[PDB]
Design a protein around this ligand. Structure first.
Ligand code: I3S
Length: 118
């Protein structure tokens, strides 16, 4: 169960179990594994390229990527580089970076992960 990609992104929840939510954008240390996206309030104390950081570091949340859906976040945010993710329990969120190459890489990595879970 380990790390395909990790990085800081801006994130907001859009819906939880299909209930719409008021956006609340903010920075998150994001960790993509082969089956999940895990969100941390902040990045590791050190060795951030390792993804998880210390084992005692607790995540705020994570989602199951099996059968998740990806889409451009244009209709849900005015932020330039925005990706919308919807997972099968009906959680929806936006990921966003000020750097399009960063967000582009996340888009491609996330897709590949969902695809390997079919
Ligand atoms: O003004 P505060 O309470 O901080 O919250 C806003 C954010 O600051 C904006 O970034 C949101 O718009 P974008 O998602 O288009 O960036 C904006 O989204 P909205 O204008 O589409 O509702 C709000 O979520």
């Amino acid at each position: 169960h380990e790390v395909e990609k990790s990085g800081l992104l801006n994130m907001t929840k859009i819906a939880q179990g299909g209930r719409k939510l008021r956006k609340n954008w903010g920075p998150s240390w994001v960790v993509l594994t082969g089956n999940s996206l895990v969100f941390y309030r902040e990045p590791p104390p050190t060795a951030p390229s390792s993804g998880w950081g210390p084992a005692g570091s607790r995540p705020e949340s994570s989602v199951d990527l099996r059968g998740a859906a990806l889409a451009h976040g244009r209709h849900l945010s005015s932020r330039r580089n925005v990706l919308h993710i919807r997972t099968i329990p009906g959680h929806e969120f936006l990921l966003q970076s000020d750097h399009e190459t960063e967000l582009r890489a996340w888009h491609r990595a996330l897709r590949t992960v969902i695809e390997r879970l079919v």
